[PDB]
Write a protein that binds this ligand. Sequence first.
Ligand SMILES: [Zn+2]
Ligand SMILES: [Zn+2]
Lengths: 136, 135
Amino acid sequence: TLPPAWQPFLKDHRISTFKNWPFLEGCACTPERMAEAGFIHCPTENEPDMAQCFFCFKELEGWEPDDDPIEEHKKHSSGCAFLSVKKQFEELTLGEFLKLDRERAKNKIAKETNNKKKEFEETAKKVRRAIEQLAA
Amino acid sequence: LPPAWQPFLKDHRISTFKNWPFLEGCACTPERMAEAGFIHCPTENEPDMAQCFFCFKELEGWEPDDDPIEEHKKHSSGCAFLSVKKQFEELTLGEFLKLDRERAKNKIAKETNNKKKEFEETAKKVRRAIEQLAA
Ligand SMILES: [Zn+2]
Ligand SMILES: [Zn+2]
């Protein structure tokens, strides 16, 4: 077993998050194929095909049986470092690895910022709207 | 980096030498004694006691001139650590996992041995006491 906050780094871990995933045998975007691509299942009650790259925290919905999780990812997140990582886990130098666990945590933080933002703008729109209704 | 893999790190091994009656001037310095896997596990009757983080051998009676690597090789020859030539960070995740797998083995080995000694001790106290009854 490895320290919990590092499992995501481990494919079989990822695979294991897809529970009740629907695109299975025959589909191009099976849990397995999602996993080699970096996704983890984050099903919302209102978003049950919700999945994100454990590294570059991008989320994605709208999965069709024909969807290649890889080229999808390079489309919507071209600058994910994971994607340039061509070595299995154990084949990496703790150096190489500790460096990536560094982008991840940085990337993570940059996503919680562009999220606090998006939640600020949202609240502004409602303050604005509300003012206009009180000016008529 | 978690809290069970730290031992694996020189800096953390040094971080463990609290007192350590031996410093500048000595050859048995905290740096050289952590560069051989030691961690300071001081006590009342053992304020200078060290230990391998890997093999677990415990060693007392240190003197300024004592070369920790040597004391280590000549008190534990079967310690994968001593053969580890690469810097932590230049280790493969795989290799690193193999060492950790061996480390936990030795820890088992060591507590098993303890349980034997503890069991035999009791065996003697019990035998003796019973013998005395047949008299
Ligand atoms: Zn990604
Ligand atoms: Zn050792």
